[PDB]
Amino acid sequence: APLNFIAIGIGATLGAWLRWVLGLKLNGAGWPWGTLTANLVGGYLIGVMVALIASHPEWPAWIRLAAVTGFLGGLTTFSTFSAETVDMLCRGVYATAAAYAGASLAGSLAMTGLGLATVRLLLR
Amino acid sequence: LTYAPLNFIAIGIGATLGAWLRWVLGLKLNGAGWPWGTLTANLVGGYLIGVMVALIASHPEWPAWIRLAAVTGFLGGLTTFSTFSAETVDMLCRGVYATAAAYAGASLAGSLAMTGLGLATVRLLLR
Amino acid sequence: SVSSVPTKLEVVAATPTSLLISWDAYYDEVMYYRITYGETVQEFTVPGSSSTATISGLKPGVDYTITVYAYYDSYGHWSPISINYRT
Amino acid sequence: SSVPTKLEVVAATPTSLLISWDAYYDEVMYYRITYGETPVQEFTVPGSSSTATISGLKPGVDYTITVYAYYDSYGHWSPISINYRT
Ligand SMILES: [F-]
Ligand SMILES: [F-]
Ligand SMILES: [F-]
Ligand SMILES: [F-]
Ligand code: NA
């Protein structure tokens, strides 16, 4: 459907803009704080959205595609994280690369659980 | 030059195409037991950013809007960490811890390997 | 308003060792349904176009909890619906 | 080919050096500098800044100095290197 392409296109554009600006303002010369922040916030917000969708089954598909598939799908990134991690590996800072992969993966999983829990606390 | 309105358009157009591709890949590949569509999007995006990083290094004369539309835009809309996170968390609450660890391992180790393959593919074709 | 998806879940027919469950199809697009059953766990999946399912291999006189999850996408599902039934 | 394209030493000290290059505006996020005997020490300088002070060198020893221009967090252009006798 054309509405689905428009809802995903608008969200992904806004999410990518936010991720880019976060990189310009936070990415440091040593560690990519902008990329990590984008993934951690996006990981938290998808936990919020998943719990909000289950509590709002009336929400049609275009809200789902614009918010999650679009915005959060554009806000987070796996390729940027992968290239940043490979660049750390070829530099020899293995402990640094392991910390970045651990903070990105285990951190995003925790933020998603926190995103699920914050909605389940404000509804009861 | 970097913070310019043309770069926002280049990123938005790229991110829109990348998100459309990930959405289609999910509709055609995401299975009932394994999210093959999300994994395909992350694996392909991991390989393509290795290709792009190697191409950018060999073409320093390229203007900034090329890498912003391709990497920051397209590949940033094609891959996803939040969708991967929600899928993995849903595996954990189901109790399939071995499946969740395998999905995280295939997404992490798989993306890094495809990125290395992408770098080596272009650097091989440049000799 | 709407709470769980599917909205209704019922055991339409039973056998000492098996059950036939059915649920109301939701207006929205369901990628797949995930069905869990166990003693008050085993899980399997049917495509989103299905509204019935067979649960077999049960023990007679045992009370089971049947839960159906409606996945709108790979990353999330609506609120599940659960019923209890003793074979 | 490489970014920076040119790399020269403007001033020297028995134990330190001041390298210099042509910094391109708004294109480099940060530079990564590596130096060691021909393990390797690293430091970074902002992308807007040219020149970098490399101190703590030993006299009469050859050092390989490499500059990496990171246009973003995920990649850098081809580096430029010089060898220098302190
Ligand atoms: F990250
Ligand atoms: F990736
Ligand atoms: F993935
Ligand atoms: F995430
Ligand atoms: Na993304």
Curated annotation (Swiss-Prot), chain B:
Key words, A-Z = Cell inner membrane, Cell membrane, Ion channel, Ion transport, Membrane, Metal-binding, Sodium, Transmembrane, Transmembrane helix, Transport
List positions binding Na(+): 76, 79
UniProt subcellular location: Cell inner membrane
| Resulting phenotype, residue 81 to I | Fluoride efflux is 3 orders of magnitude slower than for wild-type
| InterPro entries xrefs | FluC
The UniProt entry's GO CC annotations, sorted and at most eight, read:
plasma membrane
Q: Would you indicate the residue range of the signal peptide?
A: none
What is known about regulation of its activity? Na(+) is not transported, but it plays an essential structural role and its presence is essential for fluoride channel function. The Na(+)-binding site is specific for Na(+) over most other cations including K(+) and Mg(2+). Fluoride efflux is inhibited by Li(2+).
- According to the record, the segments passing through the membrane are 6-28, 35-56, 64-93, 97-125
Binding residues annotated for fluoride 2, in chain numbering:
42, 103, 107
Q: Per the record, what about its domains? A: Shows a double-barrelled channel architecture in which two fluoride ion pathways span the membrane, and the dual-topology arrangement includes a centrally coordinated Na(+) cation.
Q: Extract the PANTHER family matched here.
A: FLUORIDE EXPORT PROTEIN 1-RELATED (PTHR28259:SF1)
* Subunit structure, interactors included: Homodimer.
Q: Which family does it belong to?
A: Belongs to the fluoride channel Fluc/FEX (TC 1.A.43) family.
Quote additional remarks: Renamed the Fluc family to avoid confusion with the CLC-type F(-)/H(+) antiporters.
Question: This chain belongs to which protein, by name?
Answer: Fluoride-specific ion channel FluC
Species the sequence originates in: Bordetella pertussis (strain Tohama I / ATCC BAA-589 / NCTC 13251)
